[PDB]
């Protein structure tokens, strides 16, 4: 596939997450999660995959690293484990810190810029078992820590993410419960998802007196909604499922609030809001200096469902399911700048899951090296309209977690034999390097 | 003295009047009673018992009017149809009643003068405040009613409609704070009719797209900038709630995102639950408009005070002010039009009221309103330079064309450019007119 | 200590109440928003912002205070069933709200208490007055709507029907003083609440005689007494102007004449013609009726006075009650002679006689000696209206309880049974054993 | 049946619970409950049903009380619901207790002994955001509620309950999810059951200092358990069936901890109990002035190779909840019982059976009703004939009510229930236990 150019301000990278790579989960005093309770929990997990050892990340960082510099890859996108931090109540884990400063040290070594996102859906499970996301001073413990990492890992970090896809922790974990900690009550899961948001605020105040002098933001993930028939019932449905996927958290954090009519709705099959104090709106919507979009595919729904009466259609499409759909991405960040405006935008997360087999050492994903282009391409011409793309990160770095599928998902541009934990770079991997030294 | 403000190509200017504060003639042709004609006969509601009886009798004089309006050579005119003229009484349309204003649209289409007609202006019609008024979801419909036979039968000689003009009054005042008609004074009654009001102007709007006029149609909202006395917290939050207040609470429903979310909960915790909202209301009201009329006088320095139990808000007083006390202060223009169109984005936008009133005096056969010269020259420099910035200003009409019917204050304040002698009926063109008019030839004379 | 006084057999002794005076639990059971609500919930209108929301929680303790009359002996119980219970919203009929007075009337048919159930006690659906309530003709079809059902599901536990109380308040003091719900101050509307109050009576009335109720039905109206302060011809003039506003509004137009025509041209002459009197209208409220409810409390000693732009009239202050009420026994006697002059042989009843006193519980005990002397007097003056050939056929002393005295709040004890609302205990004062008594020493005179 | 024959100290009542009887749910300033957002979770309770109107007890009381009276019932034991005294965090609700100072004085006129309980599942839903049960500052919380209720209502109140059957609040409503709050996680589950009684004993010490006249107690629910066969196989499952209902709570209360056996099987199938502080175990064995058995019928118990503990449960002579009706089993019980609790004295609190009762021509006659009362009341009979310090048999229910999961769908009460008519019918079992009552 033919390289695609952008503007020198360009930044590339990779993405992980700290539960789906790190592994080593009860070793320098790293306290339970909510994932370690969801996987060790009968049928929450396909085949009870774990995330006990992973990738190893955690004895095998100075080898990944190393390995991202070799293909000079420009930035790194990963989470702090917030249990390896914190692992139990108000006792602080310097061996926690010690590692994630050893893991900044080889980025900075490699020259190679570091965007950390503070939540990535690992909560210890001491504040679960104190009602996690339900209770508001769930809210104030991330502020604090938040400040912590500010100070002790502040100068080795160039842009802080405050929350990665708050809609996955707030209603996959307390309302459909596929995801931890696995609750299924409605209230509660939109209870979460305002805790979040003000959670969120709270940190990005913290940080803009905590003398770090980075960026800071939040990655929201988007599907975007096409509806199923010009028809205005199917018109009518398509509109209840963006206000839900796309506007439940992004709008409350451009300073507009929640999606007032989507809102009563959620309300008639629920109840009036008593969790959004007066002043958590402005809290919520303090300015950030970047939004992190993670983009994967579209959806197509029709009119059904006693919450929302929703139905979408299944799917050329990824082995989560997922349609490829490259110019929902165009649409999708074409809408956000109407809300956004002119603040920065990184693609903080994109990528597909092939059947990944690797053969005589080579692993030849060309489905894979297709989507990259595709979507590099729905990025630049984005970039040409004067949007504000600033980067795109590639999910993932390497094969990892993929929560309740297990390891059956592969989206990594680097093959992991989890047998033998070895990586091997797959086609994608050298392609997007390609593209890497190609913009420079 | 004043020099002369350099405007685009085609930029529009204009006056503007209120059918009940200049026509008169309140019983004539079958004219149905309206909120302010029992407003001001009651007692003790308007200064010295003023009424609109006979106002300036435009009723019987707007050929007189429209053809000094030619003589000075003004592009445009802002008036108000009667809703009382129109339906008197409960479903009766008056053929009389629209024969008057399809007159006047032929005075205007002969002088080339182009016409915004607003289709409510505070005149509900009694009948109408019979069966509950604006606190009554009725009424919406009946709107939608009699702006869809305004389109029909009167459309072809209108260049633009307005549904609403100042929204904020006539739910806030007629029913909050009761100064103005129906003078009611139960602030849920008001935030209830503040709704059915934007309800009814998404069914205006709605009307007129299927209504085959292929005209312009908005709504004209009245703002008050606001400044907080003090950097102090607690004024900085009350000139908050002063600005979602006045400012906020119409145009952000309209502009399609629903009421002010955090003032909203606030007037919840005053009030009670919202119970007047209904699903598909939001979107009706922000059925897409084609411009926004903007009414822009003072601003005001708001400091916060606990002895209002409602919204804890106090005004300071404006020295450098007009007869209705309100601050000469120009720049809040400017930034008021930037943060509209900071909402608005690129939605035509037309100052559709701007002027003030001074102690006007007839001194050897005309008015010398030195003072009122300096408020529109300087209004229009902060105007012109909303535009060198990119806005998308495209007109400014002048409240006044002529002294009128100043509501509470009756007759006691002189808005127009043209000075009106109610004993004789006589106008009086002051020195504001005569520059307004050479404002005008200016701006039609540049290459 | 008094002597007791001698009736007639077929005389019918009772206590009176009224629905949202007592029953409190206003969110309970699905009811609705009243007037009363939404009015003693804005600010300044009610003493110290007392509204009903508790009251006497009659809601709920219905059953001990049938029982204290059961005990205590009372033959009759008038009281007001809620119209917000019944429908709380547009075309909702609620069960839950009949079922409630299905109860209470049932504890009154076990205690052998006849029942007297007053249609509108002033607590009109606030969903009504959104649609503008009394000044709305439509009301008066929604009452005989609402009536009407009462008559069917609750017609067998009930011995007489009351269609209004008071509609002199209901019309001049909700719409003209707005002192009352729903506060309005425009005399044009309270003349027209008050055609479609006695309209609505009307409708109720021959809905009842087709509803099968084999029962009695009537109206209560309220009447002072009005005496000449002077013989100067204006006091004699005034006093004149003050009896047809009070006595003369309601009861001559329900007796089959008409408005009282002389006090109506100067009402009209102060606003303008009564366009809401549409013919038949006088024929409706003149629909026969089977007895006249008579409310007495004082007389009121009635001055010219020019300053009084509406009818010019000053009431003297008064020996009396805790509210400024002067006690003037032969009032009543006159009274009941004057409605006797013109309602003829049509059976009378006194719905409502009391007087407020400062009551204070001292050991357990209100000797609140002066109520007795007020129901002693008045009752002695009911027996000589009955010896003069009055067809005086029953008295129901106001009230039962103390209770919320509406604009005045709870600083007005009616009740012959103390209620300390802290514990919403209830203690029979003095007044509530000798009036129990006197009902023994009626029962036992051998005749 | 014939009556049967007790000792002058015995003492005869029947037993309610708040939820299952009050109804009125917003009325007075309760706050929600975790049965309320349990019921009003779709799929969770029989057909939707819910405690929203119940038996409208907090209206009908007075009838109620009066309808005890008429039948001249000794006692009655009740629930005080925790949301109507602490409706939200710390606020202090005296409409809350107002109610329940007239039910007493209502008792008190009707010369009727008042056992209350304090916790009958119903927490508050505020104490639930905080983690409920799984949270230990609950027990500390219920610690305070208790000792409120024992200073405003201690007088009216002749004998408290501080919990009651934990092993359905802990591992039905924790582990299973059948009941509130309906989390399925087996490690929250055991977490909570030690907070569930770690707040027993903080409810004992603050009673011993609370100045209140009456005994204090817990009333726990037995299921005797019979092994399938002679298998040794089925000998184990039926010891680790035995442990898991009926010792992990006694015992702790008895003063000999956790059943250690049956413990180290809990810890191999999750992990060590890292929630047992030490000095827990003592609090909970502060001793108690009784103990409440509710007992219903035994279980039939084979080994299963379940991945928890192993156990299946085999069931003609079943009620309508399926239980067998075996009244030896209860003799059975109480004999072992006593061999734990020595001469503590002991108060069969819960006892009674569902049968599908049809009222026709005005009475209901439910002579499987009258058999199963008098055929434990012969068992319980034999226990004092032996020795036992069983002082009082009260039956389940008073009146048909909200069987939680299953509804409306279960009628356990000696008193007709219309509930669309709200009218009481006395069954012909409140017949004959009005004259039991009356015999001895
Ligand atoms: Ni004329
Ligand atoms: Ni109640």
């Known amino acids: 596939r033919e ?16 539960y789906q790579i790190e592994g080593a989960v009860h070793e320098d005093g790293r306290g339970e999660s909510i994932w370690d309770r969801f996987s060790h929990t009968p049928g929450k997990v396909y085949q009870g ?33 917030w249990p390896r931090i914190f692992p139990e109540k108000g006792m602080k884990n310097e061996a926690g810190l010690d590692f994630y400063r050893r893991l900044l040290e080889a980025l900075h070594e490699a020259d190679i810029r570091s965007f950390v996102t503070l939540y990535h859906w690992d909560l210890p499970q001491w504040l679960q078992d104190r009602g996690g996301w339900a209770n508001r001073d769930t809210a104030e413990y991330f502020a604090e820590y938040a ?23 707030a209603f996959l974990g307390h309302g459909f419960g596929v995801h931890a900690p696995g609750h299924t009550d409605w209230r509660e899961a939109f209870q979460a998802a305002h805790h979040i948001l003000y959670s969120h605020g709270l940190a990005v105040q913290a940080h803009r007196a905590s003398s770090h002098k980075g960026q800071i933001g939040i990655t929201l993930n988007f599907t975007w909604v096409d509806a199923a028939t010009d028809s205005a019932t199917d018109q009518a449905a398509a509109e209840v499922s963006h206000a839900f996927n796309n506007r439940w958290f992004l709008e409350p954090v451009a300073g507009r609030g929640y999606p007032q009519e989507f809102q009563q709705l959620v309300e008639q099959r629920i109840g009036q809001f008593d969790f959004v104090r007066q002043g958590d709106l402005a809290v919520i919507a303090e300015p950030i200096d970047f939004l992190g979009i993670n983009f994967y595919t579209r959806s197509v729904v029709a009119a059904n469902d006693a919450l929302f ?7 050329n ?9 490259p110019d929902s991405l165009y649409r999708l960040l074409t809408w956000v700048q109407s809300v956004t405006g002119q603040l920065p935008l990184y693609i903080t997360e994109n990528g597909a899951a092939f059947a990944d087999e690797p053969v005589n050492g080579r692993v030849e994903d060309v489905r894979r090296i297709h989507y990259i282009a595709d979507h590099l391409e729905a990025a630049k011409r984005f970039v040409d309209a004067g949007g504000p793309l600033k980067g795109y990160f590639l999910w993932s770095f390497m094969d990892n977690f993929e929560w309740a599928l297990g390891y059956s998902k592969r989206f990594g541009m680097v093959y992991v034999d989890y047998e033998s934990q070895q990586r091997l770079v797959k086609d994608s ?11 420079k």
């Open 3 to 18: 390289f695609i150019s952008f503007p020198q301000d360009f930044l590339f990278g990779t993405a992980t997450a700290s």
């Open 49 to 81: 995959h774990t995330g006990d050892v992973a990738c190893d990340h955690y004895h095998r960082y100075r080898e990944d690293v190393a390995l991202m510099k070799e293909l000079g890859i420009p930035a790194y996108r990963f989470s702090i484990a």
């Open 147 to 169: 400040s912590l990492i500010y100070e002790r890992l502040g100068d080795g970090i160039d842009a802080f993410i405050t929350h990665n896809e708050p809609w996955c922790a």
């Open 309 to 315: 009466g929703l139905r979408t259609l299944e799917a």
């Open 317 to 325: 499409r990824t082995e989560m399911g997922w349609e490829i759909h």
């Open 429 to 439: 991997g050298r392609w997007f390097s390609e593209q890497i030294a190609a913009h």
